[PDB]
Amino acid sequence: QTPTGIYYEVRGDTIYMINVTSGEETPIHLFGVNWFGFETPNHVVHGLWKRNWEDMLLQIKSLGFNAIRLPFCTESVKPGTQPIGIDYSKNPDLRGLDSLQIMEKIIKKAGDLGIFVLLDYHRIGCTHIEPLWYTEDFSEEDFINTWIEVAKRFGKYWNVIGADLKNEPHSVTSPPAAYTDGTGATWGMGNPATDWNLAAERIGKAILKVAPHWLIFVEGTQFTNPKTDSSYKWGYNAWWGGNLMAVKDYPVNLPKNKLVYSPHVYGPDVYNQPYFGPAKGFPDNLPDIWYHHFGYVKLELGYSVVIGEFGGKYGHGGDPRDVIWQNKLVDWMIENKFCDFFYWSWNPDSGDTGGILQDDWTTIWEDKYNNLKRLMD
Numbered sequence: 001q002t003p004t005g006i007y008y009e010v011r012g013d014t015i016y017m018i019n020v021t022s023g024e025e026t027p028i029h030l031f032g033v034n035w036f037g038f039e040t041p042n043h044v045v046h047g048l049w050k051r052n053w054e055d056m057l058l059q060i061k062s063l064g065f066n067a068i069r070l071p072f073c074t075e076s077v078k079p080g081t082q083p084i085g086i087d088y089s090k091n092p093d094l095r096g097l098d099s100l101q102i103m104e105k106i107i108k109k110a111g112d113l114g115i116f117v118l119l120d121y122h123r124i125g126c127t128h129i130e131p132l133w134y135t136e137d138f139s140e141e142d143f144i145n146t147w148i149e150v151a152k153r154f155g156k157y158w159n160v161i162g163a164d165l166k167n168e169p170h171s172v173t174s175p176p177a178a179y180t181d182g183t184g185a186t187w188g189m190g191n192p193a194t195d196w197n198l199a200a201e202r203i204g205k206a207i208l209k210v211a212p213h214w215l216i217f218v219e220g221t222q223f224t225n226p227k228t229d230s231s232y233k234w235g236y237n238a239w240w241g242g243n244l245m246a247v248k249d250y251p252v253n254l255p256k257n258k259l260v261y262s263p264h265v266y267g268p269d270v271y272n273q274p275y276f277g278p279a280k281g282f283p284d285n286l287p288d289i290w291y292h293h294f295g296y297v298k299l300e301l302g303y304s305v306v307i308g309e310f311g312g313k314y315g316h317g318g319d320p321r322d323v324i325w326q327n328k329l330v331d332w333m334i335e336n337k338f339c340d341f342f343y344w345s346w347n348p349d350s351g352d353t354g355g356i357l358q359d360d361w362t363t364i365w366e367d368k369y370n371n372l373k374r375l376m377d
Contacts, residue, residue: 083097
């Protein structure tokens with residue numbers, strides 16, 4: 001049932017942490033941040049050229065976060081991969097360590113601070129998010145085996161809550177083509193080699209055989225199938241990882257008490273969506289859009305929904321409607337009790353969203369954080 005003594009499960013739509021010996025159960029909320037870098041050519045979380053890694057985790061904790069989503073790529077989780085872009089004078093305890101050992105040290109320190117860690121297989125290579133969970137040189141079996149290896153190693157850390165199976169399944173062509181051309185993910189189209197709802201079952205089952213105490217976080221696709229996407233006016237304008245419209249008729253066939261649906265949702269800094277125009281009713285039109293793309297998965301179907309990424313520059317060098325967008329999204333999360341999320345990102349070096357930290361890697365954006373701090377309380 002668990003190698004750590006801790007078992008994570010969904011009851012109703014709320015995540016619980018269960019101590020299996022004592023029987024004790026506590027509902028947890030994830031107030032999270034993404035700290036990226038393990039999925040990149042750096043092979044390490046970013047910012048260690050300016051900061052000490054432990055000081056970073058203390059800063060994250062000081063702001064009330066209790067969860068980190070940790071993106072990784074295949075190479076960072078293999079022994080011997082060398083990280084790039086570390087200041088060793090600021091990080092002397094990291095001299096000699098390869099990418100995997102720094103991942104371990106960061107997870108163990110997070111657990112010491114009571115911070116839960118969600119592992120996110122973000123990229124198969126270390127350059128960009130592939131639309132599918134395999135490539136010409138890296139098969140679905142290779143993807144699964146890598147998850148199995150990750151789950152064997154990191155399932156022994158009590159604070160790791162589970163596996164976000166593949167970051168942002170999406171399409172690289174337009175519909176109606178994208179449904180059949182084999183280049184992108186689908187959901188409910190029928191082909192198990194493209195249908196993320198079938199692939200998530202295959203990958204999730206394998207993980208749960210080796211880490212039965214983990215949760216399985218399953219993101220949306222960008223497009224699903226034509227009947228579902230055509231059923232809603234904004235059905236073709238969901239984000240990568242953000243279309244969960246096919247959950248109702250095509251649910252992932254995994255145990256409900258182990259499954260979390262994890263949509264990504266963004267504002268005008270990422271893409272100038274037509275519904276971000278006032279001409280189309282922004283921002284008061286957003287609760288219905290969110291509700292259709294993903295929110296009904298909790299509010300109508302009662303599954304656990306954790307927002308895996310959301311963020312934006314909040315008016316600092318980007319589109320100033322982002323301020324209105326983030327405020328409205330937090331208002332809606334508070335009203336609808338979506339209390340579990342991971343902000344994108346802690347890092348400032350995200351080109352279309354910036355981060356909680358400013359470009360000095362030290363000072364936070366006070367306004368952007370003050371809005372987020374409303375979800376925390």
